[PDB]
């Protein structure tokens, strides 16, 4: 059971022409229920969809939170989206995926990341004051700075912390690196 | 040391001809009869043609319905099988063999003949390097992906054959009439970081000869 | 003017004695010499026995040939069978024509169990430039040959685009390979892929991910 499957269902990718795409699900959406079944993890979503399919259910009701709620309005009823139940017999899927999140899996010894004490388990929320939701976004933001200082806003054990580091040149590649490995397992 | 070396095979459309040659050494060529025997996955080993030590007499197997003819040239220590009116059922590996009165004592390495109306497709060659990791090993496995070719075979060497230890050419898969294989080599990490490692891929049927240097994956 | 018939397949314990038979369909087995060729996977045949019972220089003396007139059969006997005796064996005779048996594949049971080594590779930059991605899984150094190979995407079974070679012998152990064909977008949209190999009641796996170091 890869750890990423045990996280909340925050959509990172929507496949063009999928059930999800045509019903208007978008990156960022958080799926919390289908028909019924409470959805707390990617595993719950997969299990519910397989059960509905094998049970002969053809359409069902999908509940998602989109974007940040106003203080006090977080518990407000969210109405159904009606989705076709993917045909598991034909290997059809909903069309959503998490993508790897910006969670540090490992730190290279002696790297800038190590020197400034970034740790496995850290979640990077912002890079040079820009919010990021995916590992891909981390990569592109870090790559943009091309040698300049990088400010990272990190979440560690419920506590937001600030880090600043200078990327290091690798003479082997002629490119900069900060020394962060993803968590993919 | 006896050596028998076939050549002249490859891809041919139904109805056309090939001419296989077998070049012999390490024995008195004129002292022994020569032969061709072919092999397929399903039909096994199947005698095709024989010629007497002097060239006087020729014999042909059942399925070669006087479509082929064997001959020899003792001066050149070589014999030939001319193959006309090839059909798809002629697709096989063809071996040359030397005789010793009552058996075939030595066999060549075999040459593949594909009879098909499908045209040759040249492979795409891509480098395979391990994904970047924190932990590294003392030996490393590199590879070359030889993707989407027809027909068999391809050959892969490494550093023009200077790197021969730890080489594995994995048998191809076949999907939608095209073959794919990978060749791998395990080399010391110290060899990889101190000199170039290159696979040399050859696909005779498409006259493809390609070199791919394997370079480390970066960040 | 006759056929030679051999059993397709024969299994024997390491160290034991095995007899491989070759039956002539018509005419007496005794009227023409029978020879025996060994062929290892991907190699040329070599002579094991000639003129019924002659063993060439270089062939171990554990190999012997005989003719059984009562069953109109030739027999290749291998005593104290070794791992390297795994091969196909073809008998051969002639009269007017030249005839081969259909070959027997000999399996040697009870060898040391050997768990597969997996090596996985992600798609190259070059291939992704054409918007394609082939994942490669090499499976080596296993015995016995019997394995099942499966892929997973995001820890879930994936069968679409999977091409897996049957195991083949190199040296004294087997290799196989498996490919997962994806589009660039299929590759990038996943957190990981896993090549899984089941062997002798255990599974061994290795994963690849499009997410790289920064």
**Number of helices (H) and strands (E), helices first, in chain A?**
4, 14
| A182–C209 C-beta distance less than 8 A | yes
CATH 2.60.40.10 correct for C2-110:
yes
- Tell me phi and psi for residue A19, to 5 degrees: -45, -45
Distance CA B4, CA C79 (A): 32
Distance CA C153, CA C192 (A): 6
Strands B111-115 and B10-12: parallel
Claim to verify: residue A80 and residue A53 sit in the same structural domain: yes
Cβ–Cβ < 8 Å for C186, C133:
yes
Distance CA A100, CA C188 (A): 10
CA distance C155 to chain A (A): 6
Neighbours of A87 (CB within 10 A): 11
Residues of chain C positioned with their CB less than 8 A from the CB of B127 = 124, 126
Experimental method: X-ray
If you measure CA to CA, which chain C residue comes closest to B50? C98
CA distance C116 to chain A (A): 21
CA distance C202 to chain A (A): 17
Distance CA C206, CA A64 (A): 34
Distance CA B60, CA B175 (A): 36
Q: Considering A61, A80, A99, which residue would you say is the last residue of a domain? A: A99
Distance CA C149, CA C168 (A): 14
Which of these, A131, A121, A118, lies nearest to A161 by C-alpha position?
Answer: A118
| Burial class, B96, CB count within 10 angstroms (exposed 0-12 / middle 13-18 / buried 19+) | buried
Claim to verify: residue A61 and residue A147 sit in the same structural domain: no
Residues of chain A positioned with their CB less than 8 A from the CB of B134 = 106, 108, 181
Q: Which residues are CB-neighbours of C195 under 8 A, at least 6 positions away?
A: C118, C120, C135, C137, C149, C150, C151, C178, C180, C205, C206, C207, C208
Distance of CA A14 to the CA centre of its chain: 12
CA distances from B197 to B141, B181, B203, C120, C174 (A): 11, 19, 20, 19, 25
Claim to verify: residue A104 and residue A89 sit in the same structural domain: no
Distance CA C62, CA B209 (A): 45
Three-state SS for B135? coil
Cβ–Cβ < 8 Å for B199, B183:
yes
Distance CA B91, CA C36 (A): 25
Neighbours of C71 (CB within 10 A): 12
DSSP 8-state symbol, A136: H
Neighbours of B30 (CB within 10 A): 12
Three-state SS for B41? coil
Buried b (16+ CB within 10 A) or exposed e, C72-108: bbbbbebeebeeebbbbbbbbbbeeebbbbbbbbbeb
Three-state SS for C158? strand
DSSP 8-state symbol, A50: H
- Secondary structure element (H or E) that encloses residue B81, with its range: strand B78-83
Check if B184 contacts C (Cβ < 8 Å).
yes
Mutate to test the interface with C, among B62, B137, B143, B173 (most CBs of C within 10 A): B173
The separation between the first and the last C-alpha atoms of chain A, rounded to the nearest angstrom, is 9
Claim to verify: residue A123 and residue A134 sit in the same structural domain: yes
Claim to verify: residue A83 and residue A141 sit in the same structural domain: no
Three-state SS for B30? helix
DSSP 8-state symbol, A38: B
Neighbours of C125 (CB within 10 A): 12
What are the strands of the beta sheet with B68-73, ordered from one edge?
B3-7, B18-25, B78-83, B68-73
Distance CA C50, CA C71 (A): 20
Claim to verify: residue A69 and residue A113 sit in the same structural domain: no
| A1–C155 C-beta distance less than 8 A | yes
- Secondary structure element (H or E) that encloses residue A135, with its range: helix A135-145
Distance CA C54, CA C57 (A): 10
Three-state SS for A45? helix
Three-state SS for A22? helix
Total domains in chain A come to 2
Phi-psi region of A172 (alpha: psi -120 to 50; beta: other; left: phi over 0): alpha
Neighbours of B75 (CB within 10 A): 8
Distance CA C2, CA C4 (A): 7
Domain that holds residue A181: 100-185
Claim to verify: residue A92 and residue A4 sit in the same structural domain: yes
Tokens of A182: 């993803």
Q: Considering A99, A124, A139, which residue would you say is the last residue of a domain? A: A99
Tokens of C107: 């399996």
Claim to verify: residue A112 and residue A165 sit in the same structural domain: yes
Three-state SS for A70? coil
| B50–C121 C-beta distance less than 8 A | no
Claim to verify: residue A47 and residue A115 sit in the same structural domain: no
Cβ–Cβ < 8 Å for C90, B44:
yes
Cβ–Cβ < 8 Å for B4, B94:
no
Residue carrying structure tokens 């070959």 = C103
Which DSSP string do the residues of C39-89 spell out, in sequence order? E-TTS--EEEEBTTTB--TTS-TTEEEEEEGGGTEEEEEESS--GGG-EEE
Distance of CA A123 to the CA centre of its chain: 11
Claim to verify: residue A9 and residue A82 sit in the same structural domain: yes
Domain C111-214 CATH (choose: 1.10.10.60, 2.40.10.120, 3.90.1280.10, 2.60.40.10): 2.60.40.10
**In CATH terms, are C2-110 and C111-214 the same topology?**
yes
CATH code for the part of the protein at B118-215:
2.60.40.10
Check if B135 contacts A (Cβ < 8 Å).
no
Domain boundaries, chain B: 1-117, 118-215
Q: Which residues are CB-neighbours of B70 under 8 A, at least 6 positions away?
A: B34, B35, B36, B49, B50, B51, B58, B60, B79, B80, B81, B82
Distance CA C118, CA C130 (A): 27
Strands C104-109 and C9-13: parallel
Residues of chain C positioned with their CB less than 8 A from the CB of A97 = 154, 189-191
CA distances from B22 to A71, B68, B95 (A): 87, 15, 9
Q: Which residues are CB-neighbours of B114 under 8 A, at least 6 positions away?
A: B10, B11, B12, B91, B151, B152, B205
Residue carrying structure tokens 């190590």 = A114
| A185–C155 C-beta distance less than 8 A | no
Claim to verify: residue A109 and residue A56 sit in the same structural domain: no
For residues B98, B100, B101 and B103, what is the CA-based torsion angle, rounded to 10 degrees? -70
Distance CA B47, CA B37 (A): 4
Check if B131 contacts A (Cβ < 8 Å).
no
Three-state SS for B188? strand
- Please report, for the domain that includes residue A114, its CATH number: 2.30.42.10
| A170–B218 C-beta distance less than 8 A | yes
Domain boundaries, chain C: 2-110, 111-214
Neighbours of A145 (CB within 10 A): 17
Neighbours of B88 (CB within 10 A): 11
Tokens of C130: 């054409």
| A173–B218 C-beta distance less than 8 A | yes
Neighbours of A95 (CB within 10 A): 21
Q: Considering A72, A99, A126, which residue would you say is the last residue of a domain? A: A99
If you measure CA to CA, which chain B residue comes closest to C209? B131
Considering CB atoms only, which of C50, C100, C168 is closest to B46? C100
Neighbours of B69 (CB within 10 A): 16
If you measure CA to CA, which chain B residue comes closest to A178? B219
Claim to verify: residue A89 and residue A109 sit in the same structural domain: no
Check if A136 contacts B (Cβ < 8 Å).
no
Buried b (16+ CB within 10 A) or exposed e, B200-213: bbbbbbbebebebe
Tokens of C112: 């040391």
Residues of chain A positioned with their CB less than 8 A from the CB of C206 = none
Distance of CA B176 to the CA centre of its chain: 22
Which DSSP string do the residues of C176-213 spell out, in sequence order? EEEEEEEEHHHHHT-S-EEEEEEETTEEEEEEE-S---
């Amino acid at each position: 059971v890869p750890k990423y499957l045990k996280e909340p269902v925050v959509v990172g990718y929507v496949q063009r022409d999928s059930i999800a795409q045509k019903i208007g699900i978008k990156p960022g959406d958080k799926i919390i229920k289908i028909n019924g079944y409470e959805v707390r993890t990617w595993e719950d979503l997969r299990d519910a969809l397989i059960r509905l399919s094998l049970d002969g259910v053809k359409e069902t009701t999908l509940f998602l939170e989109r974007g940040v709620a106003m203080p006090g309005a977080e518990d407000d009823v969210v109405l159904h989206l009606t989705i076709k139940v993917p045909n598991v017999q034909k290997g059809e899927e909903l069309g959503i995926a998490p993508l790897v999140k910006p969670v540090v899996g490992g730190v290279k010894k002696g790297s800038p990341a190590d020197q400034v004490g970034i740790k496995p388990g850290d979640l990077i929320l912002e890079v040079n004051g820009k919010k990021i939701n995916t590992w891909y976004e981390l990569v592109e933001e870090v790559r943009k700075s091309q040698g300049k200082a990088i400010k990272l806003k990190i979440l560690r054990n419920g506590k937001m912390i600030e880090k600043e580091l200078i990327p290091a040149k690798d003479p082997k590649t002629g490119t900069y690196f900060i020394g962060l490995f993803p968590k993919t397992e | 040391e006896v050596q028998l070396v076939e050549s002249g095979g490859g891809l041919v459309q139904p109805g056309r001809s090939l001419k296989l040659s077998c070049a012999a050494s390490g024995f008195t060529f004129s002292n022994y009869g020569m032969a061709w025997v072919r092999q397929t996955p399903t039909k096994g080993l199947e005698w095709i043609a024989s010629i007497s030590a002097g060239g006087d007499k020729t014999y042909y197997g059942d399925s070669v319905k006087g479509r082929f003819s064997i001959s020899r040239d003792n001066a050149k220590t070589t014999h030939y099988l001319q193959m006309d009116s090839l059909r798809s059922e002629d697709t096989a590996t063809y071996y040359c063999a030397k005789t010793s009165r009552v058996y075939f004592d030595y066999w060549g390495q075999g040459v593949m003949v594909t009879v098909s109306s499908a045209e040759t497709t040249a492979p795409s060659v891509y480098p395979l390097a391990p994904g970047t990791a924190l932990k590294s090993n003392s030996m490393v496995t590199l590879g070359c992906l030889v993707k989407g070719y027809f027909p068999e075979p391809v050959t892969v060497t490494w550093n023009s054959g200077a790197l021969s230890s730890g080489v594995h050419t994995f048998p191809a898969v076949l999907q939608s009439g095209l073959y794919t294989l990978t060749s791998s080599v395990t080399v010391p990490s110290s060899t990889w970081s101190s000199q170039a490692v290159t696979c040399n891929v050859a696909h005779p049927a498409s006259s493809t000869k390609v070199d791919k240097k394997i370079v480390p994956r970066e960040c | 003017q006759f056929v030679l018939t051999q059993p397709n397949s024969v299994s024997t314990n390491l160290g034991s004695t095995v007899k491989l038979s070759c039956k002539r369909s018509t005419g007496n087995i005794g009227s023409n010499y029978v020879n025996w060729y060994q062929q290892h996977e991907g190699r040329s045949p070599t002579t094991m026995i000639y003129r019924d019972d002659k063993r060439p220089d270089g062939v171990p003396d554990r190999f012997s040939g005989s003719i059984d007139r009562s069953s109109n059969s030739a027999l290749l006997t291998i005593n104290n069978v070794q791992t390297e005796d795994e091969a196909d064996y073809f008998c051969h005779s002639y009269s007017s024509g030249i005839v081969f048996g259909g070959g027997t594949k000999l399996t040697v049971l009870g060898q040391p169990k050997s768990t597969p080594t997996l090596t996985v590779f992600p798609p190259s930059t070059e291939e992704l430039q054409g918007n394609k991605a082939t994942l490669v899984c090499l499976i080596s150094d296993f015995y016995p040959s019997d394995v099942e190979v499966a892929w997973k995407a995001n820890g879930a079974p994936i069968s679409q685009g999977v091409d897996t070679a049957n195991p083949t012998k190199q040296g004294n152990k087997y290799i196989a390979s498996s490919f997962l064909r994806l589009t660039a977008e299929q590759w990038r949209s996943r957190n990981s892929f896993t090549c899984q190999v089941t062997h002798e009641g255990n599974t061994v796996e290795k994963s690849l991910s499009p997410a790289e170091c920064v």
